[model samples]
Target: MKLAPYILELLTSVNRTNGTADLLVPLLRELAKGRPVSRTTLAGILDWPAERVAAVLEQATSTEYDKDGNIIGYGLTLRETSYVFEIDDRRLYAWCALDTLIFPALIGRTARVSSHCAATGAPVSLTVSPSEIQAVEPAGMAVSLVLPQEAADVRQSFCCHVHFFASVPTAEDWASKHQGLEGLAIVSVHEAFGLGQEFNRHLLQTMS
Candidate 1:
């Protein structure tokens, strides 16, 4: 599979030790388990204080939280991406379309996603599991992404959220208007998910 280059670069960049990211792999693992996470919980696990947890949480410009400062996203989308996660009747958001695909596999749980095309606003949906993807509404599609020239400068260069479009033309149009100079790349959602799987594979191996 031909993975999106931006996905591959940003995946590794999130763990860079230059303060560009908070070294969030462990946090991601906990988050992916389909439950609510909080600074207080992480504080206990890491032997850190609330203030220290807040500092780490603040590093992710893209992550969203509730009014009480609980995590909603960690660059994998919680409530911002086009793909919406439906679990226990709660509607959440993901980082990207591929994230919706990868989460099911990592969390060992099923996922149901609802979304729309970036351009046409057409309805899209999918039922995903740890081992398979099923019941896709618009099965054929591509993901829209923007990459930084230098991965280390992600705070200034990455998207507010990764966008989605069913057609390349729609993605191209969105890119031309929004971030024509950000090295915009269009890739199939499946390929992007494959890259994310590889990312998880390597992350687990490295941390193991």
Candidate 2:
């Protein structure tokens, strides 16, 4: 479960930018697509029972203001939140990292594009796009299914060196790709952190 160094660097950068390290998983889930999400959906993403997710969310909801006294909104209050762009022709959905507010996207229709990893430097090279990413449990690991068309060579190369890729699919093509290791679960920066420390601890304990 050791975290890759790249993931650590990513998390460090994100924390430095925002000043708070809480609810990062939820924030990333919201960024996957632009759409309102309900509590159940959020719970599903976290792979936590609804009640457990509810407890954490309730705490966030009750807090009136930041230490700086900035007001928090009833919906989509997390500053780390991002927008999801629906493909072709679809309405924008305001996806938030905190609470449940909207139903899941329609089965056939596209959901909002949550986030993109565009090569931002002088020589732009690659972009990574995730369509339907959601949260799952244990306070670690972010999972998603990368569609065939959306897969890019640059992204593939990136995964080859840095991330782990597994193939998962919607109901239509599950049988074809679910054989062994095709499904992908892209571990996030923060999860990578806990994983690294935990693994080191486990190794030390066992060795000792």
Candidate 3:
């Protein structure tokens, strides 16, 4: 839906450059294990010194740490949220609806996602793989999107608004009320997956 330009801008504004993307791709894999990851462990995984990893983690606003200074959340988290992403026997969580769609590809894992429709509060479910959507409940389920206008705090501005709706009607109803949003658009679940794939491809390309 002509979201490529905005997605490209989003990649830059969030500082998702080659270096960060390199770190994130593996960091996400660690978080997928459904546990807190210490700076030392991540350092070992990346073969960077602990000090170097700590510097990167400290600078990124998206990193969430536990009481012992271990990372508990990034985009994929252990903490509970509206969206539950189950993968490899671990019940992990995503920061947003879109996170649930995109993380499978990023981490190279299959995920069973369950979330509630924003407008109707009805349950929405899907089985997502690295390269395809295996199944989805309520075939007409749709996803909401917001223009990446406020990059300073994307979680609040963009992710908080993106959601799954029971149907097009439900998404439209929610959109109608949220007219103040910059570029709110509703698309089918499959289309949303494609957007996620597109973003992942661009993000990975930067790492090379």
Candidate 4:
């Protein structure tokens, strides 16, 4: 949909260096282990020089760190959030609804996602595989999106507004009460997953 350009721009703007893009997947793998990822651990995972990993980390935005400087959250996170992303035996979280949809591909595994409707607080669940999404509860589940602002803090400016709704009607109702959102669009869960795939492909293209 028309959201593609906005999604691509959001993905590209968050990484200050191409190195950040290159290291992104590997770093995510470590974070998916369901614990805070130390820079040393990440360096070891990527088998890159420790200093090189540090350089990429320095350029990464929207990344959350612990008091000990270990990474607790990126797109996939250890921090608690409204969206719960479970892969294998690890219980993790995502920065937003979009993150929950796209990360299954980056990490190369299926995720059991659990979240609530922003409008009604009803549960919305789905199974997201690398290639496709399966078993969306309520079938009519929808996701809310906004075109993120350039150079804005992604977590506050974007992730905070992106959410799940039990249905389009609920999404619209929620939108009606919120005057701060921009370019809001409510699309089906599958549509949102496709957007995520488009974003992933865009990032992969840059890595090459």
What TM-score fits each model? 0.74, 0.23, 0.91, 0.89
State residue 165's C-alpha deviation in candidate 2, in Å: 41
TM-score for candidate 3, please give it: 0.91
| Tens digits of per-residue lDDT for model 1, 36-151 | 67767877766666776776566556667777878756745455556687755656667566667766666667878778987789877778776666776677766666663454
Backbone Cα, N, C clashes tallied per candidate: 4, 23, 0, 0
Q: For each candidate, what is the lDDT?
A: 0.63, 0.32, 0.82, 0.83
What lDDT would candidate 4 get against the real structure?
0.83
RMSD of each: 3.8, 16.5, 1.8, 2.1
- Tens digits of per-residue lDDT, candidate 2, 92-123, equal 32232111112122122333324322111111
Candidate 3 colliding pairs, count: 0
When sorted by lDDT, best at the front, the candidate numbers are 4, 3, 1, 2
lDDT of 3: 0.82
Best by TM-score: 3
At residue 183, what lDDT does model 1 achieve? 58
Question: What is residue 31's positional error in candidate 2, in angstroms?
Answer: 4.5
lDDT of 3 by residue, 36-126 (tens): 8877888887888777677766556767888998899878888888999999778998888889988898888899999999998999999
In the range 93-161, model 4's lDDT, one tens digit per residue, is 988998889888998999999999988999999999999988999799999888776665666777678
RMSD of 3: 1.8
Q: Which stretches of candidate 3 lie over 4 Å from their true place?
A: 16-18
